[PDB]
Symmetry: D3
Subunit: 250 residues, 6 copies
């Protein structure tokens, strides 16, 4: 194989320059499925890769796994393999009152609550999305009539304390992170997720384009247990938008 982790060769990519990067390997196929010529390429660790065809052009789809570490690996290997553009798609929880389940969030930049973005650029540097990518994502969201919020995302290296969850084994949050949510909510932060700070930092500081869309599945300020159908729907809308954006970016 041409790289240490993902188990891909250059040839396998057939000239692809754009990759869509969910976190869940399980979602790779679902996104592959919207375009033409879907083919599983490899499954190793958290990296499930398919290739596909979008208007006669190769496009990759590759899971990052959870967290900046597994993400930094998958970007690095995919870049060594000719991918210049990287679109993340997730599902996510809102942290603002006016966001509703099923709205879409396009991320301009991320609060760097991770460790891997530091290995690319010191904390002062902005975890910012590429303008091209963010635009394609906004317009793509319009072309299917999504309700879209455009804003800052908090990117955490933990699911539990760094997002201020308290229904845990310990039930405590270390002092640094205790009451941090109120701050990010006062500062108009939209949601939490766990791989954008890595993603956007590494791409901005190395000349690669990157962007992020997500669909809202819960709102923690008015928190409802998500309905199976609705999650599924929200997922395909986000999936679709990120494909439409891919199409504009090719």
């Amino acid at each position: 194989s041409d790289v240490f982790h993902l188990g891909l060769t250059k040839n396998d990519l057939q000239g692809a320059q754009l990759a869509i990067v969910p976190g869940d390997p399980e979602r790779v196929e679902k996104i592959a499925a919207l375009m033409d010529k879907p083919v599983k390429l490899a499954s190793h660790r958290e990296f499930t890769t398919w290739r596909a065809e979008l208007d006669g052009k190769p496009v990759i789809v590759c899971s990052t796994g959870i967290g900046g570490p597994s993400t930094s690996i998958a970007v690095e290997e995919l870049a060594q393999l000719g991918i210049r553009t990287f679109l993340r798609i997730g599902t996510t929880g809102a942290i603002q009152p006016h966001i509703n389940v099923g709205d879409v969030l396009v991320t301009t930049a991320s609060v760097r609550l991770d460790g891997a973005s530091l290995h690319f650029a010191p904390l002062e540097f902005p975890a910012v999305a590429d303008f091209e990518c963010t635009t394609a994502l906004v317009e793509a969201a319009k072309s299917i009539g999504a309700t879209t919020h455009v804003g800052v995302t908090a990117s955490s290296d933990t699911f539990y304390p760094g997002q201020e969850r308290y229904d845990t084994y310990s039930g405590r949050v270390v002092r640094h992170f205790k009451g941090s949510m109120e701050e990010w909510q006062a500062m108009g932060v939209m949601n939490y997720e766990m791989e954008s700070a890595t993603l956007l930092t590494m791409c901005a500081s190395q000349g690669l384009r990157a962007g992020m869309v997500a669909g809202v599945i819960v709102n923690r300020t008015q928190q409802e247990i998500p309905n199976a159908e609705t999650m599924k729907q929200t997922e395909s809308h986000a999936v679709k938008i990120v494909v439409e954006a891919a199409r504009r970016l090719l």
Copy 2:
């Protein structure tokens, strides 16, 4: 007066909700004079304010002074008088080889090399511009057929050591900043200037919209001395672009 520093009353703004914010109080008159019915409002400290009218709406032009401190005042005091949108206009030195004299840079976000942004958000929070304002700026630039780079700016609390100038009194740069320019250059940083990190972080964390455009008057990678007329042609061009962006944000 209604505010501590600016010497303005709520009535002076006649309902204005958009401010164009250059650094130099000299530039204020120039920019107001491109719009309809300009009237000087006030002048105190580094803060020079004019009111004008664009497509029938009141619009403010207000100078910030150099640096985050005086910016943070201007923005806070305009905000109390009803400004919701802040558009910074400057001229600037590029640090990339591919940007030329006469180009225009629109800033997605800034490297926060300043002290005042921290008094609004901790360093991990992105100094990111408003998407609508960024979009208007780039569209306005394309509308006059500008060559325009869109990306990241390093926002420094000093002109001299923080941008590694060494033709100074001491000729010395502190350790922390010696070699830093090469870092920002490796990382695709376009330019330096001295108010965006403050402006964009305070805005983004407070629900106000901000963006920034600048025209390039020197490249430090291939550095020529500018003649005045080029400066002026370059200032007029960024000025027209900022007023066209204001148009689309009204």
Copy 3:
């Protein structure tokens, strides 16, 4: 399922209170297969879980994924299912001249070059292993006549820049990390890997026991390409040592 990510119920563990936690979901089956009555429990994301039986007691094997983020999930969700003891097994590159291919390293504590450990304890808090688990690991190694180094490991949120690899896309290392390897080498650091800083800090600060062993497959100070069989002989050897340590911790 009882937990957000792992796809496990309390009943699946049949009372298990010890988890062997490799990084790669492939290794899970291998390790369970060395114990009695292995049964696959679940597989979702980077998390592959098996149950087995050792000296008549239930024992879990669960993969963490690469990096602190996904580790912190695994550990938290196992912990809610009753795991009190966590033993990480890996293969690794040594950065010291005196450690050879085929040796075994047991980790006392780790250099916290990751983001997730901070979401449990501030940086001053030691990423230290449990004394009993450390003791069992080293005893188990001596029991098969391993050559075994016991000391400090550098735990990195990246594979590439954080371990100063320069045969990458950019070929660049950020300032903070360029020259860092030589520092860890001066300081007697044995190896790098990517989950221990998280694992050991979250464990030690939450009342759970953790340790880590790894077998050496390359030395970067005298670096040879490994052949597969050596890898496999080396993986089997660390695997047998981890199961013998589990024995003594039951």
Copy 4:
């Protein structure tokens, strides 16, 4: 002009080695006015410069503008123009109960709540005044019978949140700065202002002398709306002291 910002030539200085540096351009003339041969030299941005004569010796007076950024520029340019000594004069609010409106504060050193002092020396370095300057200021304060307190000043890059003002657009203070005032007051800090940390750091670490006096116009622990007369008086007393000190330092 011989410098980038201030619009001065060497010759214009007529051999001056000492500068007095209020923040308000409006105050420049008022200070010039106490000595002989007052002459406006230039007005550009926040930099209003006069020269004057003190016992047959040239002395400059130059506003810095608000904040360490504009201050660092004016010191750098004035130093390139032969100024070795720099006296700041302001008006200020006390934060200690026993200080009264119209007392004088001479600053020994400043709490570094700014960004520009870091561009000269890392945060560990003391923002300390020169002993000569601080002495001249103490004795000058005596020669007109001021009530003087001699102590530490907190130097903030913001007027509003970093001084813990809550009557703002947002009414909030970010977590770092919320409750910081109580700490500085517990630590015997005298007052807040916004340019000494820059001033004293840059001068101490580059072999220039610098000192700071201020007159008290409000006491925030017992806060009264300042009376126009009294402010005017307090201003001329501070102005006078700083001139007397200049005279001793020449």
Copy 5:
């Protein structure tokens, strides 16, 4: 003398490779006294040194004085004088409910609340004990039937605020340290003392072995005034254990 502070020559050591390092000079003789051939060697500053004989082998005993600064000196000089192993012995206050007066604490690693450990290794590095030393100390504690807890110690550069004492001149604790104890107690920290973070950091990062035992004289969660007899007893038990460990390490 062969070193700057301790007032020893190489010869004086007679080939000694292991040193026991209490903090109190007064305790040096008491520890010397358990072995053979006790001889005072020197008394300068806080450094009281005796030599002695343990199974026909030279062993040093040398007080460090309070705090990482005096400790770093005594390790450095003793290392230049051929000491490779360094055992600390103290008496200490527990901060956990289940620890009792007269139990023994062996330290695996220390929370770095000091300044001198930074002069050897940046804060990320673990202040970890050597495995050999920690083992000898555990087993030595067993060979005299101590009740032993094995865990993390918080190492403070102050006795008073950094251990959250409030019966002081000022009665206040600076904001950083106010409520830090609750955090270290939530994180299973055993006790506070003032020289292990220096000790273990300098030794781990320079190839020297080091370990720490202490005996509990007070429990601050259930705080009793210590009884003279019991303190004396606890001291000799700790003293004995650390000698037994020395014997295993020779």
Copy 6:
């Protein structure tokens, strides 16, 4: 005894409110012996205390030990016995070319390269001396016709790496401190020593007065080995200056 460490009662001080605080317990007797009616009070640890009488007032001499930890104890415990003024006396190495052997340095403030100052004030807070004590010290020096430099001192938690000494066991300096001396030298730092950062920050933030004088025994820029008599002549000279300053502060 009234205090935990010093072995003093309130009565022992006979009303003393000024302490001269050398580092070395040997120097205590020397300094008391220059005043009237010296009597040894106590000796425990690095703390040696004498009482004497100067112009009819009781005065204490008390040793601090090397480093902030033991300093912070001494100062706290003296403070509880009524000491309000603390004057440190030392001998020291200069790092500037223009300071010679036999000169005297009086310290305005210190570079806080220690851990204990933080347990009183965060790093941004200046390690600044009391103005009255600084003034007395410099006046006393001029009164015996000392050559005297007045400026900034770097206060280090280590003798060896923190002052970049490389004739050590490892011969290595950690990254953070390698090259740091050249920085302090560029910045006009006079000397290094190991207790002032603690002393001055704890004093200034607690309402106590402190200053420091030292006589120069080596210059590391042109370094000669000192002969004893020069040391002694130099110690007597700083000692006389500190007692003359005490005179003027009584």
